[PDB]
Amino acid sequence: QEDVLAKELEDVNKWGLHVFRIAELSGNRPLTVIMHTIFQERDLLKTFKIPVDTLITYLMTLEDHYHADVAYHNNIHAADVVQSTHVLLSTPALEAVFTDLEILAAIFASAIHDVDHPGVSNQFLINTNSELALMYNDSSVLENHHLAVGFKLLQEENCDIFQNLTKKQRQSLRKMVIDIVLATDMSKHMNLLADLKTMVETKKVTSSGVLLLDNYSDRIQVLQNMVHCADLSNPTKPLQLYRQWTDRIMEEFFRQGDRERERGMEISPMCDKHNASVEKSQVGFIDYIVHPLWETWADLVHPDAQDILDTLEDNREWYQSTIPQAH
Amino acid sequence: PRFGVKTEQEDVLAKELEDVNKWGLHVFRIAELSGNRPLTVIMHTIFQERDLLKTFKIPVDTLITYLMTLEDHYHADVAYHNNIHAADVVQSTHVLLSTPALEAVFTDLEILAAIFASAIHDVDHPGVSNQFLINTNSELALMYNDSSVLENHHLAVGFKLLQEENCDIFQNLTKKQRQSLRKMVIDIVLATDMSKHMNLLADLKTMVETKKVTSSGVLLLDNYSDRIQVLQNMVHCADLSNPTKPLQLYRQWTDRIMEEFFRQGDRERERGMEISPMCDKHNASVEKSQVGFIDYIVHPLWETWADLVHPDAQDILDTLEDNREWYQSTIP
Numbered sequence: 058q059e060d061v062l063a064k065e066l067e068d069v070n071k072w073g074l075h076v077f078r079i080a081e082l083s084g085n086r087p088l089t090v091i092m093h094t095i096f097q098e099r100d101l102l103k104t105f106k107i108p109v110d111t112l113i114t115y116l117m118t119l120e121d122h123y124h125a126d127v128a129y130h131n132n133i134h135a136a137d138v139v140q141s142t143h144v145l146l147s148t149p150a151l152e153a154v155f156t157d158l159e160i161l162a163a164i165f166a167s168a169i170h171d172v173d174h175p176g177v178s179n180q181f182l183i184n185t186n187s188e189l190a191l192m193y194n195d196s197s198v199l200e201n202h203h204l205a206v207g208f209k210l211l212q213e214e215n216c217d218i219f220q221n222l223t224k225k226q227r228q229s230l231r232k233m234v235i236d237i238v239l240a241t242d243m244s245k246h247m248n249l250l251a252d253l254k255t256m257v258e259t260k261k262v263t264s265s266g267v268l269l270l271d272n273y274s275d276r277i278q279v280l281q282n283m284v285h286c287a288d289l290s291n292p293t294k295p296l297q298l299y300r301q302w303t304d305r306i307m308e309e310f311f312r313q314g315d316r317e318r319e320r321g322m323e324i325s326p327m328c329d330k331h332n333a334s335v336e337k338s339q340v341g342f343i344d345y346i347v348h349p350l351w352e353t354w355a356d357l358v359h360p361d362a363q364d365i366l367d368t369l370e371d372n373r374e375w376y377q378s379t380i381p382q383a384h
Numbered sequence: 385p386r387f388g389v390k391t392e393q394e395d396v397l398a399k400e401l402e403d404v405n406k407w408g409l410h411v412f413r414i415a416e417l418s419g420n421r422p423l424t425v426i427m428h429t430i431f432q433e434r435d436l437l438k439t440f441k442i443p444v445d446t447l448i449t450y451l452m453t454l455e456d457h458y459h460a461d462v463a464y465h466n467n468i469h470a471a472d473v474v475q476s477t478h479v480l481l482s483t484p485a486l487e488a489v490f491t492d493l494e495i496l497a498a499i500f501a502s503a504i505h506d507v508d509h510p511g512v513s514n515q516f517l518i519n520t521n522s523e524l525a526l527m528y529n530d531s532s533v534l535e536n537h538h539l540a541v542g543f544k545l546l547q548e549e550n551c552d553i554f555q556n557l558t559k560k561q562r563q564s565l566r567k568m569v570i571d572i573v574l575a576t577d578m579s580k581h582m583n584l585l586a587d588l589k590t591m592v593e594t595k596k597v598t599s600s601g602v603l604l605l606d607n608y609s610d611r612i613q614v615l616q617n618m619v620h621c622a623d624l625s626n627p628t629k630p631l632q633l634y635r636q637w638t639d640r641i642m643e644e645f646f647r648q649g650d651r652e653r654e655r656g657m658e659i660s661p662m663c664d665k666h667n668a669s670v671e672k673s674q675v676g677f678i679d680y681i682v683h684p685l686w687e688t689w690a691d692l693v694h695p696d697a698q699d700i701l702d703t704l705e706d707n708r709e710w711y712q713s714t715i716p
């Protein structure tokens with residue numbers, strides 16, 4: 058029913074959009090539907106002379122290159138990161154900070170950032186001597202590959218959505234998108250966080266409270282962290298959505314662990330279906346990765362992200378409540 | 385065969401290979417005397433010299449098969465970035481590793497990594513720059529996201545050739561030796577990207593400022609970071625060693641890099657592109673450009689290396705200064 062779909066797409070500017078319902082209602086086309094809605098919402102097709110049929114053709118072939126049998130790293134995850142980035146771009150602390158081209162880069166980066174993901178980690182690909190790790194010299198193996206596939210698809214018939222950008226704009230967009238997707242590699246998380254903390258310490262704001270970002274380095278660092286936050290946003294969502302993401306990532310991990318077991322390898326942490334606690338694993342994920350990042354983003358845009366941080370803290374307290382603890 | 389390939393006389397080739405431990409080995413003669421197999425000949429000689437086949441249980445037929453295949457993937461129609469340049473960088477790294485200030489500093493696996501990295505470090509080079517590949521939307525630049533495009537490719541090819549029939553020279557390394565060597569080779573070849581030269585040199589100057597030495601001048605390296613940084617700079621110096629060589633060698637290397645640069649500029653001109661600096665055969669100042677190259681890149685690098693291994697490199701530096709004066713004296 059196209060009636061219900063348009064009703065759910067009314068929430069596209071809100072944290073917590075019911076992306077799984079959109080996936081079902083759209084015929085498993087959440088990335089196409091949500092990207093189109095956002096491009097309409099931000100008037101991107103007219104600012105960048107994007108033919109609507111070119112946009113739809115690219116989005117459908119991009120969505121086609123996310124794998125349906127990969128439980129977490131599929132087109133629903135892409136659509137979720139896109140929509141979350143779309144919300145974060147509109148945070149009041151960043152009002153009129155970014156150019157339309159920077160906004161287009163951040164949303165495009167989000168849409169392609171996990172394309173053709175195989176469902177196994179960079180470390181797995183390195184340790185199994187995979188062809189992808191051979192091509193990429195063991196360095197941000199997946200993220201380099203996502204970028205290459207995402208740009209390569211712009212070459213399919215009637216898929217060049219950037220055809221009416223100037224050369225300067227195309228060159229700037231490509232650079233920003235590369236910079237953003239490479240920052241989604243989790244091995245870069247601690248260095249990204251260390252620098253974001255220092256940027257918070259020295260941040261400049263207009264009197265109206267809007268952040269001041271003078272040069273490319275400061276601008277791209279904010280977009281990098283903002284898409285990294287959107288990628289790591291599942292525990293900040295309403296519990297009904299967060300539970301579904303947790304099911305999917307645990308399915309994907311356990312599939313990788315089963316391949317490791319078959320192969321005689323050490324099963325990676327959290328990948329052993331027989332000896333894992335989901336509750337501990339999420340509480341550790343929030344405590345050591347997700348909350349340190351979001352409390353720093355929240356500092357940067359204070360108080361814009363307080364409701365997001367409140368949900369994250371409530372979900373942490375919820376997941377820890379059934380783990381026995383010394384009181 | 386005596387030297388790894390068949391040659392129309394091993395006696396002339398042997399007297400030339402007696403210089404494999406000397407700066408200024410006549411690498412172009414070796415290429416001729418070996419039937420254009422200088423990389424195979426010189427690598428075989430070094431592996432025997434250093435006893436690396438026995439240390440790592442490398443069958444000699446596997447070594448020769450890999451070197452043949454690797455050599456075949458350097459392009460014969462590229463004037464500079466060909467199998468002779470690879471052979472030169474290997475042999476120069478081999479001399480630098482023997483410098484007195486580095487006596488017993490590196491393990492056999494670190495030596496193997498430096499020499500292997502030198503051999504593969506430009507394989508399948510197409511004769512155009514990273515920036516040309518980016519500017520022309522090449523598939524390689526698409527694959528590698530405009531970052532160290534060629535150097536990522538040379539690594540990928542050099543490692544992939546290990547998988548061909550009877551080519552796996554590392555088959556008898558342990559799995560963690562393989563892992564360590566792989567990481568060091570990647571770290572070394574990525575450092576040959578010239579866009580990293582200024583950062584690499586700045587860090588080398590910092591290492592020189594706080595260098596630790598025994599009483600006899602031998603460097604004291606403390607950890608992987610120290611060791612890999614010295615190997616990275618060593619192979620970068622070997623890559624940038626042409627102007628420090630005997631002048632007749634340097635003159636040929638200059639002729640070859642200009643031929644390659646000019647053919648890239650012709651491709652740029654044909655496509656209406658701005659011609660890259662030093663690639664316009666119609667507006668070139670070859671001699672002035674060599675003096676600039678030495679003043680701004682090569683001398684600052686080699687004076688810092690010479691500081692690290694003082695006084696081991698003093699003659700290399702003196703030759704650099706004399707060669708600078710040759711090109712200065714021939715500016716029209």
Ligand SMILES: COc1ccc(/C(C)=N/OCC(=O)N2C[C@H](C)O[C@@H](C)C2)cc1OC1CCCC1
Binds near residue numbers: 243307310313328
């Ligand atoms: C909903 O929860 C999660 C959502 C997303 C993620 C991602 C993308 N995490 O990135 C880490 C990573 O890629 N690994 C890759 C390899 C499998 O080895 C592992 C040790 C880590 C992680 C979530 O939860 C965690 C903690 C318990 C379940 C997973």
Ligand SMILES: COc1ccc(/C(C)=N\OCC(=O)N2C[C@H](C)O[C@@H](C)C2)cc1OC1CCCC1
Binds near residue numbers: 513578637661
């Ligand atoms: C014997 O002389 C040379 C030997 C080697 C080189 C190499 C491999 N690289 O140099 C940097 C580079 O890769 N570039 C590539 C692109 C064309 O754009 C430029 C930024 C330079 C350069 C030599 O001399 C050159 C530099 C001065 C006169 C010609």
Ligand SMILES: [Mg+2]
Binds near residue numbers: 171199241242
């Ligand atoms: Mg990813």
Ligand SMILES: [Mg+2]
Binds near residue numbers: 300304
């Ligand atoms: Mg459940």
Ligand SMILES: [Mg+2]
Binds near residue numbers: 344348349
């Ligand atoms: Mg905390």
Ligand SMILES: [Mg+2]
């Ligand atoms: Mg020994």
Ligand SMILES: [Mg+2]
Binds near residue numbers: 505506534576
């Ligand atoms: Mg090179």
Ligand SMILES: [Mg+2]
Binds near residue numbers: 555556
């Ligand atoms: Mg064996």
Ligand SMILES: [Mg+2]
Binds near residue numbers: 605610
């Ligand atoms: Mg030290």
Ligand SMILES: [Mg+2]
Binds near residue numbers: 667
């Ligand atoms: Mg003129």
Ligand SMILES: [Zn+2]
Binds near residue numbers: 138
């Ligand atoms: Zn992701």
Ligand SMILES: [Zn+2]
Binds near residue numbers: 469576
């Ligand atoms: Zn080279």
